């Protein structure tokens, strides 16, 4: 499935503050009105149907625009690296429901890594359970841990309440991450609207990463038996992936220093004039 990412994918090119100015820059951005691949989730049980739990590996290319909508925090994290063989260092960003953890280590990943949570009937609480991202870790260059907040453990489907936009690109060894969180009321596709992605982290990994893959989580309620047979729920969530390309953009800085709008001068003849 394909959707159109109308305006989205714009993040601040740099730290520099500007005001009431139009600053042109060339950086890797998602093109406007680009075509985005749509991935869908509802893990398939033994029975088959519309159900799909898509955890494919995707190309890193120029960098990846990642967007996800979540009813119930299905998507735990991502993997970045060439092989993911445990041959070399790779990036593992996962939220183990308790904290965000980042590890560079040479992890061994399973064929189909995923998370699962299980809920016991005796106690009414959703806790994580099955976790099979990595067998073992090799040497580790860097490790990071983050806040204690919790994530949505159950497979609850409904209008997508939240939107989390991320841009991953590694330039010069630096793995840059940008993000933005907003509430949304829309199941089908990305909302049409413009918003920036402020940079959260800059990691010095300096590893060459060819490809990446997303990680999802399972959600089990009390009713379910713990087993891996068919007691698990992937949830409603879906995510989108686009690819950045070197383009020129005109960024409009407001008085605040926040960017209200942008023009993709590559897009249309009207746009081309705007940059000039």
């Amino acid at each position, epitope marked *: 499935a394909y959707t159109n990412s109308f305006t989205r994918g714009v993040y601040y090119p740099d730290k520099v503050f500007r005001s009431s100015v139009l600053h042109s820059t060339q950086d890797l951005f998602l093109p406007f009105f680009s075509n985005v691949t749509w991935f869908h989730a509802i893990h398939v049980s033994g029975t088959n*149907g*519309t*159900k799909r739990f898509d955890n494919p590996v995707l190309p890193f290319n120029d960098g990846v625009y990642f967007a996800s909508t979540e009813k119930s925090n299905i998507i735990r994290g991502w993997i970045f690296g060439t092989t993911l063989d445990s041959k070399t260092q790779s990036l593992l960003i996962v939220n183990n429901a308790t904290n965000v953890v980042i590890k560079v280590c040479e992890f061994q990943f399973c064929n189909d890594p995923f998370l699962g949570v299980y809920y016991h009937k005796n106690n009414k609480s959703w806790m994580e359970s099955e976790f099979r991202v990595y067998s073992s870790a090799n040497n580790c260059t860097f490790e990071y841990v983050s806040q204690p907040f919790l994530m949505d453990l159950e497979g609850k*489907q*409904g*209008n997508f309440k939240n939107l989390r936009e991320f841009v991953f690109k590694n330039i010069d060894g630096y793995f840059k991450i940008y993000s933005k969180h907003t509430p949304i009321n829309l*199941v089908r596709d990305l909302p049409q609207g413009f918003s920036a992605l402020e940079p959260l982290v800059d990691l010095p990994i300096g590893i060459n990463i060819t490809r990446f893959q997303t990680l999802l989580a399972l959600h089990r309620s009390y009713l379910t038996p713990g087993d891996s047979s068919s007691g698990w*729920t992937a949830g409603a969530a879906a995510y989108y992936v686009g690819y950045l390309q070197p383009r020129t953009f005109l960024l409009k800085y407001n008085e605040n220093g926040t960017i209200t709008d942008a023009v993709d001068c590559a897009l249309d003849p009207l746009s081309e004039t705007k940059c000039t």
Partner: antibody, heavy 126, light 108 residues
Framework: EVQLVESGGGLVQPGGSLRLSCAAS????????MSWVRQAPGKGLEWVAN????????YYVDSVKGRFTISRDNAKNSLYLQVNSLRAEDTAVYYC???????????????????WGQGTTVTVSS | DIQMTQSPSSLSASVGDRVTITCRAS??????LGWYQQKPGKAPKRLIY???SLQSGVPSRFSGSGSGTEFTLTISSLQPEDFATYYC?????????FGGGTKVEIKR
């Protein structure tokens, strides 16, 4: 042949409870989303809830959230809309309705309601 | 969310005459729109889905067209049976929404 019948209904006081069943026949029940819809007397149509084929994903209108629970028994061929805690505004008729097409298909007609029951009336009053 | 606004809210026409009720989407629906016919107490019957498709058992007098955000349900030759309220609905995105409804009346 193809028939869907609502059930339950009846009056109960506010903060009351009702379990509207909906029996379906004439089609492969497990493959179609089902939908409750209400029409207060004098008012226009308002969609209540929907449930996906697998029975996992369920959606509700805001007014209803927490109050009503849409259940399903593909084996049973029944709809179950559990209602608590009833309000006056809740008075209306409830129709269970078929989606069109297969829930499986990418081209999804499921939102289109091709078949409807007669309805059931729920009256909430002292 | 999206709001569907039908117009006119009510109309009166003679038997054979052609009637056109329009529905306007606040947001671009694409063609995820359906039309339903409802009689006073009775439950609604689906007239059209996918904007153009007629559903089985409906007369050709009923037709539906649409492009962009605006859609139209036309009834080529009004019949007395046709008395009812007609509603448009958009299945495009959640929540599903119905228009206000247009009451049709037989001019006499």
């Amino acid at each position: 042949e193809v028939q869907l019948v609502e059930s339950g209904g009846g009056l109960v006081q506010p903060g009351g409870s009702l379990r509207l069943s909906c029996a379906a026949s004439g089609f492969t029940f497990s493959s179609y989303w089902m939908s409750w819809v209400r029409q207060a007397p004098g008012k226009g149509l308002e969609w209540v809830a929907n449930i996906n084929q697998d029975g996992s994903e369920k959606y509700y209108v805001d007014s209803v959230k927490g109050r009503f629970t849409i259940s399903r028994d593909n084996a049973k061929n029944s709809l179950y809309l559990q209602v608590n805690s009833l309000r006056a505004e809740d008075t209306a008729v409830y129709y269970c309705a078929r989606d069109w097409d297969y829930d499986i298909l990418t081209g999804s007609w499921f939102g289109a309601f091709d078949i409807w029951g007669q309805g059931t009336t729920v009256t909430v009053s002292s | 969310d999206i709001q569907m606004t039908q117009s006119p809210s009510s109309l009166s026409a003679s038997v054979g005459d052609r009637v056109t009720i329009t529905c306007r989407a606040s947001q671009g629906i694409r063609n995820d729109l359906g039309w339903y016919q409802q009689k006073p107490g009775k439950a609604p019957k689906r007239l059209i889905y996918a904007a153009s498709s007629l559903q089985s058992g409906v007369p050709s007098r009923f037709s539906g067209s649409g492009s962009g955000t605006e859609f139209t349900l036309t009834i080529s030759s009004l019949q007395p049976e046709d008395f009812a309220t007609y509603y448009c609905l958009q299945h495009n995105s959640y929540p599903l929404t119905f228009g206000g409804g247009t009451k049709v009346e037989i001019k006499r």
